[PDB]
Ligand binder design. Structure first.
Ligand SMILES: NC(=O)c1ccc[n+]([C@@H]2O[C@H](COP(=O)([O-])OP(=O)(O)OC[C@H]3O[C@@H](n4cnc5c(N)ncnc54)[C@H](OP(=O)(O)O)[C@@H]3O)[C@@H](O)[C@H]2O)c1
Ligand SMILES: NC(=O)c1ccc[n+]([C@@H]2O[C@H](COP(=O)([O-])OP(=O)(O)OC[C@H]3O[C@@H](n4cnc5c(N)ncnc54)[C@H](OP(=O)(O)O)[C@@H]3O)[C@@H](O)[C@H]2O)c1
Ligand SMILES: [Cl-]
Ligand SMILES: [Cl-]
Lengths: 197, 196
């Protein structure tokens, strides 16, 4: 892009993926002049749907966008997902790109608290996304994340993240419509495979 | 439908239409077992600046085309003059004489319309709101009064966090509209340079 080779890495369980995630990816790509956003469904952790389901929904959701792709690195590694391993794996595939690891602000707080912050900032820049008013509801998480990272971490508020996977699962459970919360292909996957019933 | 012959009427300016509106229509259709939802772009408002009616019509046609349960009506944009919901309802009642009409719009707008006794004989009213929406006091008391009497329904729609105002701002700021609305609407806004 305008600032050199840059790759977004959208880490999440994606159970299910929804337009909130897709809007967040689009926003972060625009904000940081990213060339591509790679969606990386996380390993098995509630019990999340089987990995292949979450992979396929993400493939279906992102297929039409030339600037989105999906990586199996976390689901195929085996065992729990450590963001250091995700980033190590993607650096090896894209050694000439700066990595921008993107996930929910709550998850970013967990990653940074025990994963090994200093080694993480060697591998990537970090982007935490949330619904608006995150800083107001989480004063101290926000300021602590800011102190640790400085220029390497950025928090971004996305109105469309009012759409949550938790709400989508409940809608599916209750047979309420998922139309226009996610692509029809994902609505149908959820329906066809009976995911949250 | 299961609760009777029922038609949703989604009233709004739709400048632009976005997934929040489509989600809201889908939700209200489910809650009330509506057979179909008719989107009715409003007439030009009577210093508020709103895209030409044909643009708002075409965007709403593009956005709803693929859904068999959605359609778009020109009654308000073709009537001439300012839009009075009583006229919208008279026109639609004439076109769909056996349907009970469920007029659905933003909670703010539903409160504005109620400055109503004869309107409530013509349709059932549904206000849709985004989480955390802050109403002016005059609208709060209006809505409280009718809720107190079970005379209308309010429904929270998380996807209404997506707003037409924020869409126009994104377009003005050259920020992406992808996944906030269908691609055909993103492209319409772009091709016609709507919010420059
Ligand atoms: N020690 C570690 O390194 C460690 C620990 C925990 C998590 N993680 C990583 O952090 C990422 C997030 O995990 P998770 O989804 O399981 O967290 P989570 O606890 O299910 O999500 C926390 C919040 O973040 C949102 N969210 C998650 N991923 C998102 C994304 N990419 N874009 C926007 N919003 C997102 C969630 O909304 P939705 O439910 O709507 O998605 C929720 O509001 C994954 O890559 C995971 O591997 C790493
Ligand atoms: N005297 C009257 O009879 C009278 C007076 C005023 C309004 N109205 C009618 O009220 C309706 C709304 O008018 P307007 O669009 O000009 O109001 P508005 O002031 O542009 O909308 C107020 C709020 O309602 C939301 N909204 C509007 N229509 C919506 C819909 N169908 N579904 C979900 N959210 C919706 C808007 O969000 P977005 O910006 O994201 O859409 C906004 O947050 C129209 O049918 C209009 O004809 C009638
Ligand atoms: Cl006119
Ligand atoms: Cl009829």
């Amino acid at each position: 892009g305008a600032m050199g080779r840059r790759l977004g890495v959208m880490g999440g369980t994606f159970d299910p993926i929804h337009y909130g995630h897709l809007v967040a990816a689009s926003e972060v790509a625009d904000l940081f002049d990213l060339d591509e956003v790679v969606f990386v469904p996380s390993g098995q952790p509630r019990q999340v749907s089987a990995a292949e389901h979450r992979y396929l929904m993400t493939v279906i959701a992102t297929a039409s966008n030339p600037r989105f792709s999906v990586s199996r690195v976390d689901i195929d590694r085996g065992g729990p997902t450590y963001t250091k391993d995700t980033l190590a794996d993607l650096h090896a595939l894209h050694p000439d790109s700066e990595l921008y690891f993107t996930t929910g602000a709550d998850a970013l707080a967990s990653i940074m608290s025990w994963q090994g912050w200093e080694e993480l900032f060697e591998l990537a820049r970090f982007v935490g996304v949330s619904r608006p008013g995150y800083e107001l509801r989480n004063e101290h998480i926000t300021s602590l994340l800011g102190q640790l990272a400085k220029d390497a971490l950025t928090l971004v508020e996305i109105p469309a993240l009012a759409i949550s996977s938790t709400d989508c699962r409940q809608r599916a459970e209750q047979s309420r419509p998922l139309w226009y919360l996610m692509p029809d292909g994902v609505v149908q996957y959820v329906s066809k495979r009976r995911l949250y019933t």
